Write an enzyme that holds these catalytic residues in place. Structure first.
Site, PDB file in Angstrom:
ATOM      1  N   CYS B 104     -11.821   2.392  -0.397  1.00 52.59           N
ATOM      2  CA  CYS B 104     -11.942   1.245   0.534  1.00 52.59           C
ATOM      3  C   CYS B 104     -12.523   0.050  -0.187  1.00 52.59           C
ATOM      4  O   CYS B 104     -11.927  -0.446  -1.140  1.00 52.59           O
ATOM      5  CB  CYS B 104     -12.732   1.665   1.787  1.00 52.59           C
ATOM      6  SG  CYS B 104     -12.789   0.533   3.034  1.00 52.59           S
ATOM      7  N   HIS B 105     -13.752  -0.332   0.164  1.00 52.00           N
ATOM      8  CA  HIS B 105     -14.510  -1.323  -0.603  1.00 52.00           C
ATOM      9  C   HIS B 105     -15.149  -0.756  -1.844  1.00 52.00           C
ATOM     10  O   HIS B 105     -15.688  -1.502  -2.658  1.00 52.00           O
ATOM     11  CB  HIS B 105     -15.611  -1.943   0.266  1.00 52.00           C
ATOM     12  CG  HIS B 105     -15.114  -3.006   1.213  1.00 52.00           C
ATOM     13  ND1 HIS B 105     -14.503  -2.711   2.381  1.00 52.00           N
ATOM     14  CD2 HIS B 105     -15.164  -4.399   1.134  1.00 52.00           C
ATOM     15  CE1 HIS B 105     -14.138  -3.858   2.996  1.00 52.00           C
ATOM     16  NE2 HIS B 105     -14.534  -4.886   2.224  1.00 52.00           N
TER      17      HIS B 105
END
Lengths: 171, 176
Positions: B104-105
């Site tokens: 994701c991040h």
């Protein structure tokens, strides 16, 4: 009369919205919130509720005399737009040297203009490496003016940010 | 003892912590949460509380056999560390080609290693531009494996993510 676009999503740092807004409005300038949908609400990290004035699909960047980009995680949310429309909106400002104001994470959106090579900016520490990889000359100061682009780092910088942004709009 | 470091701050995306952790622990591997201060609580976006096992001032990346970086806004917080200690921590895994897992991040912290040039990975849309600018070949796939570096995009990718991360650790010791 001069009119500032403020691009905003959920989880803006509340004071980075309301403080520059007040300073612009005190100096006699108008502000307008650009967001996903007209009349949708976005909510700051600390609960401030803001109504979006103009949808990103309808917004005409040439209507505006400046762009303001509050920080927190609003800029990261904006960069989730699957069509990248907020970067494209901000590109009008960087390409035409229109006054462009960004505090904290705000300069993340400027990365998406591709326009930063050779520009001098500051930002919150979290984002400085990414700004540098985008080609900017990144410094660590309470406020940085590079022609039209005004940047600051954190809410503590607001006094300096606010002074410099209303000055830029007086031209 | 094959132990996986998990660097974690507040506002991690809950299941990007709990799901990979469980898959690693199911497969026989232990996990150690690394955070600002040992024995404090960090809280997920949806309110999962996690206790920090080891303070980042204490942690030795040598001790660990993999690095896992959950997403949400945890990686962003970790990048606000004044002395940049989580990037430094991660630099060991990227330099020495130790299994490195990010969803994701999560790859945002891998940017701080300055080791991404020519590497291939994916991530959530929001951070793809920044990975490119760091010199990575960024693709859009549910899971990407580039030698030791495993990346995925979003929570729906977790089945793919978890298969590959466990497979990295198994293969590290030649089980097939």
């Amino acid at each position: 009369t001069k009119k500032v676009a403020i691009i905003l999503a959920n989880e803006f740092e509340d004071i980075e919205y309301s403080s520059p807004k007040e300073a612009l409005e005190n100096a006699g300038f108008n502000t307008v919130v650009i967001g996903d949908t007209a009349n949708s609400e976005v909510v700051g990290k600390h609960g401030e509720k803001v109504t979006v004035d103009v949808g990103i699909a309808e917004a005409k960047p040439e209507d505006y005399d400046a762009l303001l980009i509050p920080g927190g995680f609003s800029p990261d949310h904006l960069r989730g737009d699957t069509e990248g429309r907020y970067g494209t909106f901000a590109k009008y400002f960087t390409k035409n040297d229109v006054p462009t104001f960004a505090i904290c994470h705000g300069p993340q959106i400027l990365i998406d203009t591709d326009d930063l090579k050779g520009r001098t900016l500051t930002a919150v520490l979290n984002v400085r490496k990414d700004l540098s990889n985008a080609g900017a000359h990144v410094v660590d100061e309470s406020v940085v003016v590079d022609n039209n682009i005004v940047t600051s780092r954190v809410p503590d910088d607001l006094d300096d940010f606010n002074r410099e942004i209303v000055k830029q709009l007086q031209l």
